[PDB]
Amino acid sequence: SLSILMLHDPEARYLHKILNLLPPEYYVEYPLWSNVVFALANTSANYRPLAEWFSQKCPEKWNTGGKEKLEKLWNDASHHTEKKITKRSIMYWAHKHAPQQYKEIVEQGYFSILAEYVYSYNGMLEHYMIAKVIYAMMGNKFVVDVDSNGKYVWFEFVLPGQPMNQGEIWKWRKEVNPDELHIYISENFSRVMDRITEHIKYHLSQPHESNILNYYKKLLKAFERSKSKIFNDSFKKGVIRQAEFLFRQRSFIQTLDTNPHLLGVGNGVLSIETIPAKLINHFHEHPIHQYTHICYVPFNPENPWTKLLLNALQDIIPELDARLWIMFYLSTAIFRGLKEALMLLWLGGGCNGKTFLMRLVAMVLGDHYASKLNISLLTSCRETAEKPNSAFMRLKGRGYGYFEETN
Amino acid sequence: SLSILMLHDPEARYLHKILNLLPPEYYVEYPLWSNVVFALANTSANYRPLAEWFSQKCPEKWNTGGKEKLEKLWNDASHHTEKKITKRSIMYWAHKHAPQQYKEIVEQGYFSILAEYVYSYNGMLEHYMIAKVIYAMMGNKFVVDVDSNGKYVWFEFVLPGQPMNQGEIWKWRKEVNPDELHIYISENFSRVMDRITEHIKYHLSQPHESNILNYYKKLLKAFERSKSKIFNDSFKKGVIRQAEFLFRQRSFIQTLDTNPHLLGVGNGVLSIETIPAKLINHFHEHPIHQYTHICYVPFNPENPWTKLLLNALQDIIPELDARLWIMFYLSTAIFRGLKEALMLLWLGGGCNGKTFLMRLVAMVLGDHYASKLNISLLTSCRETAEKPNSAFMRLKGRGYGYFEETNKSEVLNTSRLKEMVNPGDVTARELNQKQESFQMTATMVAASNYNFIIDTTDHGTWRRLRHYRSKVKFCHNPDPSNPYEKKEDPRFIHEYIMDPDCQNAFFSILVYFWEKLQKEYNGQIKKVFCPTIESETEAYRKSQDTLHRFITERVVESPSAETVYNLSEVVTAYAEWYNTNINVKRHIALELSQELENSVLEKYLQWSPNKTRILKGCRILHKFETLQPGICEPKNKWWEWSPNPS
DNA sequence: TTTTTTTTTTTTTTTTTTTTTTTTT
DNA sequence: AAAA
Numbered sequence A: 001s002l003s004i005l006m007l008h009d010p011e012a013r014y015l016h017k018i019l020n021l022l023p024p025e026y027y028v029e030y031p032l033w034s035n036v037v038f039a040l041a042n043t044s045a046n047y048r049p050l051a052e053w054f055s056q057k058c059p060e061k062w063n064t065g066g067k068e069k070l071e072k073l074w075n076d077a078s079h080h081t082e083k084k085i086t087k088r089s090i091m092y093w094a095h096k097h098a099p100q101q102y103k104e105i106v107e108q109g110y111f112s113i114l115a116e117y118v119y120s121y122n123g124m125l126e127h128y129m130i131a132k133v134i135y136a137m138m139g140n141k142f143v144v145d146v147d148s149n150g151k152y153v154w155f156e157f158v159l160p161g162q163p164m165n166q167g168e169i170w171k172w173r174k175e176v177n178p179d180e181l182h183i184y185i186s187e188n189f190s191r192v193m194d195r196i197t198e199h200i201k202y203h204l205s206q207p208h209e210s211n212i213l214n215y216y217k218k219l220l221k222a223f224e225r226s227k228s229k230i231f232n233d234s235f236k237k238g239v240i241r242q243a244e245f246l247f248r249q250r251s252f253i254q255t256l257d258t259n260p261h262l263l264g265v266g267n268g269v270l271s272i273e274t275i276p277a278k279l280i281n282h283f284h285e286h287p288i289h290q291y292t293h294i295c296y297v298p299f300n301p302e303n304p305w306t307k308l309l310l311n312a313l314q315d316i317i318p319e320l321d322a323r324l325w326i327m328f329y330l331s332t333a334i335f336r337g338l339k340e341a342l343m344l345l346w347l348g349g350g351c352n353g354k355t356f357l358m359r360l361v362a363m364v365l366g367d368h369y370a371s372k373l374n375i376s377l378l379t380s381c382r383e384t385a386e387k388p389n390s391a392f393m394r395l396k397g398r399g400y401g402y403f404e405e406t407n
Numbered sequence B: 001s002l003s004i005l006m007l008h009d010p011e012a013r014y015l016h017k018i019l020n021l022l023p024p025e026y027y028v029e030y031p032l033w034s035n036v037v038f039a040l041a042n043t044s045a046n047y048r049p050l051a052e053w054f055s056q057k058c059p060e061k062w063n064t065g066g067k068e069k070l071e072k073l074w075n076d077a078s079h080h081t082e083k084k085i086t087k088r089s090i091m092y093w094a095h096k097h098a099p100q101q102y103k104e105i106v107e108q109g110y111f112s113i114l115a116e117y118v119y120s121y122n123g124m125l126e127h128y129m130i131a132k133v134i135y136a137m138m139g140n141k142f143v144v145d146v147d148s149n150g151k152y153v154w155f156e157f158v159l160p161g162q163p164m165n166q167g168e169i170w171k172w173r174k175e176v177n178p179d180e181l182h183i184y185i186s187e188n189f190s191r192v193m194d195r196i197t198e199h200i201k202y203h204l205s206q207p208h209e210s211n212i213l214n215y216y217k218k219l220l221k222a223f224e225r226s227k228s229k230i231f232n233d234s235f236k237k238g239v240i241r242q243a244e245f246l247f248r249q250r251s252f253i254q255t256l257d258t259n260p261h262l263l264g265v266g267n268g269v270l271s272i273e274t275i276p277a278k279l280i281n282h283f284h285e286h287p288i289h290q291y292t293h294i295c296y297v298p299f300n301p302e303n304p305w306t307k308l309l310l311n312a313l314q315d316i317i318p319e320l321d322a323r324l325w326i327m328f329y330l331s332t333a334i335f336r337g338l339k340e341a342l343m344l345l346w347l348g349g350g351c352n353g354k355t356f357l358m359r360l361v362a363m364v365l366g367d368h369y370a371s372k373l374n375i376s377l378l379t380s381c382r383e384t385a386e387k388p389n390s391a392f393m394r395l396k397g398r399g400y401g402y403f404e405e406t407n408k409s410e411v412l413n414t415s416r417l418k419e420m421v422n423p424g425d426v427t428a429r430e431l432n433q434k435q436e437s438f439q440m441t442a443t444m445v446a447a448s449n450y451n452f453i454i455d456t457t458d459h460g461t462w463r464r465l466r467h468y469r470s471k472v473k474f475c476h477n478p479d480p481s482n483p484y485e486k487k488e489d490p491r492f493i494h495e496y497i498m499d500p501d502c503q504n505a506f507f508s509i510l511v512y513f514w515e516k517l518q519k520e521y522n523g524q525i526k527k528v529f530c531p532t533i534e535s536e537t538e539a540y541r542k543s544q545d546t547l548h549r550f551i552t553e554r555v556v557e558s559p560s561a562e563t564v565y566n567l568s569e570v571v572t573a574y575a576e577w578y579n580t581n582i583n584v585k586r587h588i589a590l591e592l593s594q595e596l597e598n599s600v601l602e603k604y605l606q607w608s609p610n611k612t613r614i615l616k617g618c619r620i621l622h623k624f625e626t627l628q629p630g631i632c633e634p635k636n637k638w639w640e641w642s643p644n645p646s
Numbered sequence C: 001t002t003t004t005t006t007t008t009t010t011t012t013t014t015t016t017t018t019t020t021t022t023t024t025t
Numbered sequence D: 001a002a003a004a
């Protein structure tokens, strides 16, 4: 089926090209090879021969190992709900381990796409073809989804070295209008246009029969006329309007920030899924949007501020067991999943110190995850007046809530 | 009348060609040709000649099977409808078994249409022609209708193997903008363009006189100029706007989800029209849009989760008859049509599982079919004047409404209660919009640990209520002395609900119970006797009646004395009594005066000549004032319903 | 029982048009 | 080079 694999599907040939220049030691290693097999399986269920061939390269694993076990693993990956990793991630490892050679590969790929369109339609460019060529590149950024209000929304993935606000690195951000997309389509696409022009000029230079007398002249004239369209504002608006259909991704907005084991931190995200916690400061695929402006560092008791805070905590409440219990309960606010349903309330004097800690926790967790409520919520008459309340929007996605003092 | 078929458009011959692919054994199968003739009946009435020809389509046993058989199903009543399979499905039947020829037939059909247009108009394509070609090449995937305020909304039929949300398979979904339509018209229409270009070039290749020297060249130039227009944005928007009219289907939005016998599940649509319940995971035509994310599987008691749920349910309620009645009542939540006017309320104390149970039903049945209702609706103290009340909504199409524990025992006046149980229509208005009327068909349950204060005596009110009292409590120290005590489980509520398998098992149990009830006495709830139920209800009705308690406490057993003026002092004594004996509340004296006649004081209630209805005589008690002168337990399985007595 | 729902807006142009250089004369 |  290998000939069938490179017979019908264009991105099947593209994936076949990408599968080279790979570190086959990772294929030998069970964990990473299983991860990439799962990622490939999540990319459609018609890639069974492709996955078999990927298991066929370096045949030592397919000859010395669980061949039936691997087939069953691929099958259950096909018919189960779990991670849906995609080659995107793979593209990231390919760039990380094998630079240089991939650049010319992808460049020649989208150059071939554009040249095929130009030859097919006599150099008469139009919104859809440039939109498709643009979608051939990027993919890293500019994911489009429909909001609850029915308006298309653009989400841009932030990378280091860009003009961004504090804490927006390594996570998506909401964009009212894709400014970077306009800048890119106006600037970098000119390079591909110049490449096409040089290609057609070179073919014009070589001598042939009367075809070069008129056909290439007409093609060059048409392409020169169509080149200036990419700088027109209305043309760019139409291209963006057509491209938002391709970038549209189903089930993205409602699947945003749903994972309770990932927290948007000022240096990226935190992986509290497994012990110990990991900080992710590189490319990933987790749909994280909300964040806090507090950088994360490993817990070092030798730090002077950590020592001061620990001494203050010891001074606030003397009981060791009570201190440990209350600290354990307060640390639960970092989680965002279902928790044990218990309420803590503690009283004291005007200098009890209760307010200060609650305030420090709220400030550390940030506004997105922490919220302050009103004591009147517990002590109020029933809403027989039908007037809607103003506080139940709180706790939606929040991991912590506190009540203030009252005379 | 074959010449009539010849003259009546090429679409008749197109249908001829597509139906020629039906095998003779398909025509032999009685239901197959029955539903096919019904489908052609739904599409106009001029297809009688086509049906007559179909009588001779593979007629190897038409004479054996009866000449006047196929025409009988149509000639008996050409009019009248049964909501059956129309067209839009014969193509699916042809494609499900006869590929290759079907696809080439449809390909040559729309190719002929487009070639006719391009030849007629000298290769100058426009919006309407492309829209018609697109509609012809897929009329089985999109529907357009107009909603209330007035817009054009696009619905598309989801099929396996394409990006989608979870659980929206085999059913329509609402699209603000037909994205896949744009993708198709930009991608797959280029194939037809290439085919037409190749045909034109092939015709140009063959030599002839001047009629092809420039005529083909001119039209070829025009067509290659117009080819690039399909990739335009404004042109595509215009084509979509034009095609909005072709895909128009009258009476589609208001018929959405109107059938109460169809349920949208995670893996398709569930039909409960016939016994047993049928799951559809293929092409169909039922207009459903709402759904739930609970996959449906047949009721298998061997499943470990089903066993665990059954054991827990048996432990929660000990009585077999009461358990069966409760499950039968809860099984009606699946139905969404008109139901019998029954209100269920059952009390308890501490750990009872009532609320926990309500939660399982709510999550299993889904958000679009189940709702949470505030107790303020049934408080009945508030009289909603001309003002919005959104709490009265969330009953449209819902088949289940449940309540929760309250602060303390509360009064429930018959107002805002009589219309909440009856199978009638109610009206209310909310933010924006205006007043509207809607049929309510949701089964209602309300449980509490504090008794509901019911103040009424009419048989009409005390006929749509059922009261139960749970007898099993949960405590962390289950002393092995009384059976009505068991250990708890925090994960019994913290988890066992998030796991989808539990929802699947509970849905299977609910479907099985509904099927069992339907196989019983044609539905309904009044029959199937449960001696515990309605007996607890009449015992409750004996209590919760202050007037009878007042009479039996003060005047009954002291009839010999005579201290009576009129209804006035009786009213005052009852008022101070109920004010002290019970809570304080305001009343109108006419209701008490009328009910006093209906009370058990008729033996002393005689109207005096000057009216005043003076009681013949009793003793109003003050101070202490004493000395006044006057089942089978099932063996191993209980879900099997036991025999008829059960 | 005000209060916020209702009221106030909301997109308002964009599309286009023009031409379109080249092609025909 | 002027008009479609």
Ligand SMILES: Nc1ncnc2c1ncn2[C@@H]1O[C@H](COP(=O)(O)OP(=O)(O)O)[C@@H](O)[C@H]1O
Pocket: A312, A313, A315, A316, A348, A349, A350, A351, A352, A353, A354, A355, A356, A357
């Ligand atoms: N660990 C500490 N050591 C010394 N002073 C403290 C400490 N914690 C709080 N304080 C001071 O004591 C005061 C009481 O804090 P606060 O939380 O307002 O008391 P309460 O919670 O009773 O209102 C604060 O003004 C703060 O500056």
Ligand SMILES: Nc1ncnc2c1ncn2[C@@H]1O[C@H](COP(=O)(O)OP(=O)(O)O)[C@@H](O)[C@H]1O
Pocket: B311, B312, B313, B315, B316, B348, B349, B350, B351, B352, B353, B354, B355, B356, B474, B487, B488, B489, B490, B491, B492, B493
């Ligand atoms: N079959 C069972 N197995 C284990 N624990 C149960 C069972 N039934 C009830 N429980 C305990 O009782 C609770 C059930 O809900 P409960 O709180 O009793 O509802 P209600 O609000 O009616 O009291 C659970 O938290 C659980 O700990």
Ligand SMILES: [Mg+2]
Pocket: A350, A352, A353, A354, A355, A356
């Ligand atoms: Mg304080």
Ligand SMILES: [Mg+2]
Pocket: B352, B353, B354, B355, B356, B357
């Ligand atoms: Mg409960």
